[PDB]
Structure 1
Amino acid sequence: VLKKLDEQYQKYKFMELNLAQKKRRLKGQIPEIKQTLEILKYMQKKKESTNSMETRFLLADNLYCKASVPPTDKMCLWLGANVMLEYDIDEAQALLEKNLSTATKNLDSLEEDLDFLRDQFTTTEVNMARVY
């Protein structure tokens, strides 16, 4: 019967592509935190204060203060929940590297969990559209 597969591929693909949608969101969170350390990494110079180099302080997107950076070896980091925490060059090197693949994998299964909801939304609807 054509009536089943027809109502199905629709309501497979609705929730299906949502997963291809809900797949790619989290690999979208990778480059944010992937580029992070690399910035710190070109910065990190060991046995030196990290960011000891030449800099121009970013106050805003209009104003900058060209300034002599070198601080203590630390990176104050954003943990969310309005708690900033002050890490050092390694914790940072760790914390921020950790946040990379946590964006990488949430791609997979968050797509996957509804990948059988795409079918269950589907198969629930195909009887639901036919018999009703």
Structure 2
Amino acid sequence: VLKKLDEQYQKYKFMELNLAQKKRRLKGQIPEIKQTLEILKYMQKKKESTNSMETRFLLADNLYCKASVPPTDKMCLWLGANVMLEYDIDEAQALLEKNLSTATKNLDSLEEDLDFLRDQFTTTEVNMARVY
């Protein structure tokens, strides 16, 4: 009968929107951790890339000041919530690679399981309807 088919159409469509709220937050994490690795792994340090280089600093989004670089060998990374610690290259490298590998797999392993959690919600609401 098409009447049983029509009730499962609407219950499948409404549960798609609850999945997209969770995937986009998983989506928003990925490019931010992606920028951390590729910029570090190409420059690798003032130390590791063989002294004084060039720079045009980021003062703002459109205002870059050209200067000569030479700093001392540290990187003060930003953790968040009133926290800055000074770091080095070896501490900053292996941490973000782990956050790089998971953020893909956080997007990949959930997006299948969200597709079946939708299928749990559409299947549950129709069997109670046909009985009582």
Give the alignment's TM-score, normalised by structure 2: 0.71
Task: Give the aligned partner of residue 105 of structure 1.
Answer: 105
Tell me by how many angstroms 1:61 deviates.
Answer: 1.9
Unpaired segments of 5 or more residues in structure 1? Answer: none
Deviation sequence 1:7-49 (CA, Å, 0-9, x none): 2243224324653664465245323222322111221158546
Alignment of structure 1 residues 1-132 onto 2, 5 Å: 1-16=1-16, 18-19=18-19, 22-23=22-23, 25-45=25-45, 47-48=47-48, 52-127=52-127
Q: Distance between the aligned counterparts of 1:25 and 1:59, measured in 2?
A: 29
RMSD between superposed Cα atoms in Å:
3.2
SS in 2 for 1:85: strand
Change (3 A) 1:45 1:81: closer
Change (3 A) 1:115 1:73: same
Tell me by how many angstroms 1:66 deviates.
Answer: 1.6
Percent identity, aligned pairs only, is: 100
Change (3 A) 1:79 1:129: farther
SS in 2 for 1:76: strand
Give the alignment's TM-score, normalised by structure 1: 0.71
Change (3 A) 1:48 1:8: same
Determine if contact 1:56/1:64 at 8 Å carries over to the other structure.
yes
Change (3 A) 1:96 1:29: same
Change (3 A) 1:125 1:71: same
Aligned residues: 132
Change (3 A) 1:96 1:120: same
Change (3 A) 1:27 1:48: same
Determine if contact 2:55/2:69 at 8 Å carries over to the other structure.
yes
Tell me by how many angstroms 1:88 deviates.
Answer: 0.9
Change (3 A) 1:64 1:18: same
Unpaired segments of 5 or more residues in structure 2? Answer: none
Tell me by how many angstroms 1:108 deviates.
Answer: 2.6
